[PDB]
């Protein structure tokens, strides 16, 4: 064999997807998809036609890194509906970060 067990793909990208569009309702899934349709290109029938994941892939396609975290947060700031993506978002990039806690 090669490897054991391996599971590296993007844990940022995972967090995006689970925790930022699954959790994201008509009120924001039609903005969130029009201002990021200035970034990747997108329009008003492939905001229709692409789904969920897709624009997930493009957000960490076009934003490696955190930024990819940032930038849909930052978008998604000033929603109070959005409270729970924004703490979470913002929670999880924390936890990645050195620093153990619970103790």
């Not at 990208?13 to 309702?25: C, N, R, S, T």
């Not at 978008?75 to 990039?93: G, T, W």
Request: net charge positive; with cysteine.
């Amino acid at each position: 064999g090669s490897s054991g067990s391996s599971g590296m793909v993007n844990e940022y990208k995972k967090i995006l997807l689970l925790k930022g569009f699954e959790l994201m309702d008509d009120y924001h899934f039609t903005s969130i998809k029009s201002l990021l349709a200035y970034d990747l290109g997108l329009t008003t029938k492939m905001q229709e036609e692409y789904n969920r994941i897709k624009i997930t892939d493009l957000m960490e396609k076009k934003f490696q890194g955190v930024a990819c975290l940032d930038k849909l947060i930052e978008l998604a700031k000033d929603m109070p509906s959005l409270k729970n993506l924004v703490n979470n978002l913002r929670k999880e990039k924390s936890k990645v970060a050195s620093g153990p806690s619970s103790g």
